[PDB]
Amino acid sequence: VNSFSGYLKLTDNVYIKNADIVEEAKKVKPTVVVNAANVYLKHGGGVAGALNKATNNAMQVESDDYIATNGPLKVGGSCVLSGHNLAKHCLHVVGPNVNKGEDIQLLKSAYENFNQHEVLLAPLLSAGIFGADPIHSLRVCVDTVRTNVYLAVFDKNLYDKLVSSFL
C-alpha cells in the first residue's frame, strides 16, 4: 500500500490520475519522479521546465554539473539524480524526439529504464497531446514497464480519451 490516490487502475501494474505531475510530486513526495528530459538535461519548458521551476532551479544546477562531468545522455537513456523537494530521486529519461528525426522505436528503450525502479510517478514520454502519439506513448508504456507506474496526464481531453481508447 502506497499514498497514490484517484489512480485509475489501467492494468496489473499501470495506474493513471488526471493531474499535473509537478503537483502530484509535491503532494506525494514519491521515491522516484520521472522527468521527460532532453539529452542535455536543459529543463527549459514542459514537465522538465515546470519540475525545475518547482525546485527553484536546483534541478538545473545539479544537471549542469552532471553534464559537465559525464556528457550528454543517449536518446533512450536515463540518469538518476536528486528529487530535490519533489521526490527522493528524479529519474531523467530521454524519449526520442520525432521532430529531431529521432527514431520512435527508441521510446521502448526509454520506458525500459523504469524497470530499474519498483514504483515511479511518471508523465507520458515522446507523446505530446495531439494525434495518435500520446495515445501511442501509453501502449508502449503498458507493454514495456513491469514495475508499478503511476502516470499523471495533465491534459483532460487526452486523459479522458486515452482511457476511452485503451485496449
Ligand X SMILES: CC1(C)CCC(=O)N1Nc1ncnc2[nH]c3cc(F)ccc3c12
Residues of the shown chain interacting with ligand X in the complex, contacts defined by CB under 6 A: 20-22, 36, 47, 123-124, 127-129, 134, 152-155, 158
Long-range contacts for 45-48 (Cβ within 8 Å, ≥24 apart)? 47/21, 47/22, 47/123
- Is the Cβ of residue 21 or residue 141 nearer to ligand X in the bound state? 21
C-alpha separations of 107 from 62, 82, 94, 137, 145 in Å: 25, 23, 8, 8, 12
- Is the Cβ of residue 101 or residue 131 nearer to ligand X in the bound state? 131
Min dist CB 64 to ligand X, Å, is 23
Three-state DSSP state, 18: strand
Min dist CB 155 to ligand X, Å, is 4
Min dist CB 12 to ligand X, Å, is 22
Three-state DSSP state, 10: coil
List the grid coordinates of 8: 485509475
- Is the Cβ of residue 21 or residue 91 nearer to ligand X in the bound state? 21
- Is the Cβ of residue 35 or residue 109 nearer to ligand X in the bound state? 35
Give CA–CA dist 133/27, Å, rounded. 29
Length of the chain: 167
- Is the Cβ of residue 68 or residue 159 nearer to ligand X in the bound state? 159
Whether the Cβ atoms of residue 15 and residue 47 lie closer than 8 Å to each other? no
